[PDB]
Amino acid sequence: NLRGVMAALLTPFDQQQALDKASLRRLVQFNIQQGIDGLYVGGSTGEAFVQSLSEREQVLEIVAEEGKGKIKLIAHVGCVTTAESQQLAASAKRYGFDAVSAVTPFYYPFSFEEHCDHYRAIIDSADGLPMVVYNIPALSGVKLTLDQINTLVTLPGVGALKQTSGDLYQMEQIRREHPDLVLYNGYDEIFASGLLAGADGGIGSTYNIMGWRYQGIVKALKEGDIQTAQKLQTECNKVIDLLIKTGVFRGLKTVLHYMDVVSVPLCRKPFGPVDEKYLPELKALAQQLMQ
Amino acid sequence: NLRGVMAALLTPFDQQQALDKASLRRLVQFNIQQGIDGLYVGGSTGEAFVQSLSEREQVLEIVAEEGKGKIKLIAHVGCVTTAESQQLAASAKRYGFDAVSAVTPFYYPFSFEEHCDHYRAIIDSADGLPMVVYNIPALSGVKLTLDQINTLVTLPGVGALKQTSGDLYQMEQIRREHPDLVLYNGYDEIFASGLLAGADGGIGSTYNIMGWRYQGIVKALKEGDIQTAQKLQTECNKVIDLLIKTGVFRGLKTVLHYMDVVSVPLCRKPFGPVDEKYLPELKALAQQLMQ
Amino acid sequence: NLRGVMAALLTPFDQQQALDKASLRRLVQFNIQQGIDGLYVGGSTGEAFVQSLSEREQVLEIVAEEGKGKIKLIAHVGCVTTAESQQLAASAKRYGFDAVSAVTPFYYPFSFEEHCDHYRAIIDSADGLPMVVYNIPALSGVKLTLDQINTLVTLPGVGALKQTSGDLYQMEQIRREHPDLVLYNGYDEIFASGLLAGADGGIGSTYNIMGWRYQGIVKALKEGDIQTAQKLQTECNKVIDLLIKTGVFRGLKTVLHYMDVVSVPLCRKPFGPVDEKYLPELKALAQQLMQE
Amino acid sequence: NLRGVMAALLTPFDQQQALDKASLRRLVQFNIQQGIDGLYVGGSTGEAFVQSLSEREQVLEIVAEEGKGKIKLIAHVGCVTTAESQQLAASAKRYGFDAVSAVTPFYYPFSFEEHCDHYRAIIDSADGLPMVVYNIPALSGVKLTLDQINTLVTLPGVGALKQTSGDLYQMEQIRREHPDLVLYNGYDEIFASGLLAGADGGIGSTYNIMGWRYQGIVKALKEGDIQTAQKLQTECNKVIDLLIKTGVFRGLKTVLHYMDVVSVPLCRKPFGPVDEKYLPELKALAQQLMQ
């Protein structure tokens, strides 16, 4: 039931780098409009790690007002701190989110046992909302084994795994081991490949501007049409190429600004703005996607 | 015409740890009858790096005698030394191989130009034979960029790329850049996903014992039956889970042995033998693969 | 005036995980009486990334009170966010600290320019307090180059470099490039070698329980007594070996708790408690350090 | 008694890239006159991995012939193949080298037991020659654990360890574990620091052009003159800075060439030439060094 193509919501800031509630609302609605199955809020893409708990809760509350009941809402609640995560877990519950999620805590190296108790404590605080384990070795620096992953994924309370890893051998072993597990493909660039390996949906930042393509790839693969599946994927991939040159969060916000969704396409410092030289390609991209 | 499913051939040894030429011939034929498209000989799978050039030249000659004309023959000629490689390249030509191949020279760190000059030399000595750049970062320790991969791939005389990387975002990037390039999926564990990403064939050590499944996966994806393609990949992956436990080269040789192909399922030390506990499952798999 | 042997201050918490101010003050004074050159507060050792800005502000404020120009005071003000770092940098000035510090922002990959601007803005908000650029690749996952380090270290406002790296070739080269740079060695396990290589002092978590050994290695080398320099370092290493087994922060708090300095030997979750099995060794260690 | 500053021997090649015996002998004696405690022949610095068994043996005999009895002689006998290594170990005995040495077999991933048995076999063939374990993770791609290094170092036959690692905490840990172990500091850029951490000697390539400095640092440290000890290490690093910039093996041979020691300062391909922009720098270096 949590399966599908969920977008990792971006958080629009204003000239003062404060939250832009109006753009947030425009963004939520814009995603709904584009036929997304749900939203993963306050994740890395939402720049959670560069905002406070209150700022973080404020976003959860607003998207819940906008989207609750219309699509699935998963609140990324993870912090390095379990206590901070627990507080966020409770708010998500209070706001009516469908599930809660958390990255494997970072910076300080924690044992695998400490990782499990973290999830256990957060799940406790979720008070019912299922947990989506969030695995992104590349950013967390947390390199869990398949076994550790199997343990986490079986922790009572866990309803999904957000696999932000390009190891498609592992993607399938996870599927082979947990046939019923809601498996989200974390890297947009290999979405079609991830689904073929075992993912049954996905969460990602590029879904904010072209979510329909991912839905497309999903149908095609269902309708045994690898031609449109591959075609759709290379089209997502050309966009990802550019965003990787420009900065994905900022580049996605910039395109969004061009679709009239976001007022100021800035990210919080230390992120810098997009290089002016990249604006013609982003503008152009916004235009084509607008059609 | 180099596109297809090519077994990365194993080299049988006797109790004295010396080529079991009689089993080599038996392995060559076995592969042919299982409908393989060609053989990548003298690679990592063939324990080439624990061999002498003369040993490698001998294996080259026996398989050419065994299959020149029956299937495509690609000779892995790579050595850390350019001159040794050129020697091996020159015999491949003289023995009648269809193409030549070489790992990026390892152990010592080399600049990219050195890498390109290395391939140029080998390509020259191959005397007309198309070259197959061999990319396996996990074993070579060489971490080439995409631009570098494009440069190598476009070097005159080069006719294909053997991609032993599970980075399927890079697989498609390469493909998007080179629609005519013969791209071999190097990781058996992700074959279906690798093809979907842009690969048009594969070279793998597990093909030796169940190459038919990989061809089947090719038919399925070709026929829009991703459902049986997945099924084929998981079956291939259950095998891979086991071989990775028992040790791959030796595991395969043991299976082939129970299949009456290899007399002595040994690998040359440092490799040790399979743990006896594994024998029943390998024996079981052998009988089972006889499907 | 920032050169020296300075302890990476730990932050004591109570049974309910709240700050234990009395033990903070108690730990500040203990370090002072231990004859350390100053304190590095709010850094990795201080469990800053498991606290909130106002929590870190409180700690800075309490120790500034305690360390009233009694010793050198460095405030690790770094966060991923430049703005949060600026706020902390401004409080540090406000509390009267001697220097300001910050790790290279983590989690999200940033460009070198993004990093240089980050340090400037903070240097900007410190309003006069020098900046000790903080380099710890192992934790930040940020891999700066010598030239990137050079740029940072020459950046106006920057007055020191906290080298938490085992690469002593790079340590040598940085000293070579900057003969007067306050270079602090970050890995206590190699303190003697980092010094020989060019580090002119150090900042470490284990200084909390044996800051004198580190001060000793310094004298030992100053007087060419490399023989005792070695003995001190292996004595430090025998300790670090145990601390790594148990978990460094918690192990330290545990020793310090057995020395009646820290009331509760806990670290905030997700850090769990120390395995009972190690208590016999930690009690003994606390015994002998006190014996010394 | 293998304790000491041992120079890692370069193998001079001719214009045709063939062993330049004239220069080998010339270098053996040059090193001797430098007051070096011995020579580590046939190692990484000796381009062993780009040579053949026969060529490696040849160089072994010529050097035994040139310095056997005069200085300590450790022959690097290591290859990926245990059998090849054994053969070279057997020859070292024959030529009368003092010790044997082998890098952890690389390229293919081997188990620690496989690693152990390999050293055992080679130990068996060195016929009485104590084995020197060569740890160089950077190039080998092998990251043994301390307990693992401890096992290796205590193997019956192992007499020393060449630690090519900049982990000076592990250095002191090895010295603490084995107070009577012959521990060679492998990275010349940290010589002084390695010795202070526990190494009682060192095997380095740069020793070939200024072995006196390392012997110099040793005395200063032994005398308690860290100030000059340092002043010495900084000098070696100014050099090392350059060589890295120019390519170490090729840079060294060039400097020795300007020191009328080596005829053709060529490394074997895939390595390339020293760029011309450096010749003046290297020129200037060789002059200063000779005075």
UniProtKB/Swiss-Prot annotation, chain C:
Effect of residue 44 to T: No significant change in kinetic parameters for the cleavage of Neu5Ac
BP terms from Gene Ontology: carbohydrate metabolic process; N-acetylneuraminate catabolic process; single-species biofilm formation
Keyword Metal-binding listed: no
Binding residues annotated for aceneuramate, in chain numbering: 44-45, 164, 186, 188-189, 205
Effect the entry attributes to changing residue 134 to A: Loss of Neu5Ac cleavage activity. Is still able to form a Schiff base with the substrate
This protein's pathway: Amino-sugar metabolism; N-acetylneuraminate degradation; D-fructose 6-phosphate from N-acetylneuraminate: step 1/5
Site description Required to correctly position the proton donor, residues in chain: 44, 107
pH dependence remark: Optimum pH is 6.5-7.0.
Known regulation of activity: Inhibited by reduction with NaBH(4), and by Cu(2+) ions, p-chloromercuribenzoate and N-bromosuccinimide. Inhibited by beta-hydroxypyruvate. Co(2+), Mn(2+) and Ni(2+) stimulate activity, perhaps by enhancing the opening of the substrate Neu5Ac.
Binding site for aldehydo-N-acetyl-D-mannosamine: 164, 186, 188-189, 205
Effect noted on mutating residue 44 to C: 40-fold decrease in catalytic efficiency for the cleavage of Neu5Ac
Keywords, comma-separated and alphabetical: Carbohydrate metabolism, Cytoplasm, Lyase, Schiff base
Pfam family, one: DHDPS
Binding, pyruvate: 44-45
Disulfide cysteine pairs (residue numbers): none
Effect of residue 45 to A/S: Slight increase in catalytic efficiency for the cleavage of Neu5Ac
Main location: cytoplasm
Cited SUPFAM superfamilies: Aldolase (SSF51569)
Temperature notes for this entry: Optimum temperature is 80 degrees Celsius.
InterPro entries: Aldolase_TIM (IPR013785), DapA-like (IPR002220), NanA (IPR005264), Schiff_base-form_aldolases_AS (IPR020625), Schiff_base-form_aldolases_CS (IPR020624)
Localization per record: Cytoplasm
Entry function: Catalyzes the reversible aldol cleavage of N-acetylneuraminic acid (sialic acid; Neu5Ac) to form pyruvate and N-acetylmannosamine (ManNAc) via a Schiff base intermediate. Experiments show the true substrate is aceneuramate (linearized Neu5Ac), which forms spontaneously at alkaline pH. Linear aceneuramate can be provided by NanQ. Can also cleave other substrates such as N-glycollylneuraminic acid (GcNeu), but not colominic acid or 2-oxocarboxylic acids such as 2-oxohexanoic acid, 2-oxo-octanoic acid, 2-oxo-3-deoxyoctanoic acid and 2-oxononanoic acid.
PANTHER family: N-ACETYLNEURAMINATE LYASE
Membership in a protein family: Belongs to the DapA family. NanA subfamily.
UniProt protein name: N-acetylneuraminate lyase
Organism the protein comes from: Escherichia coli (strain K12)
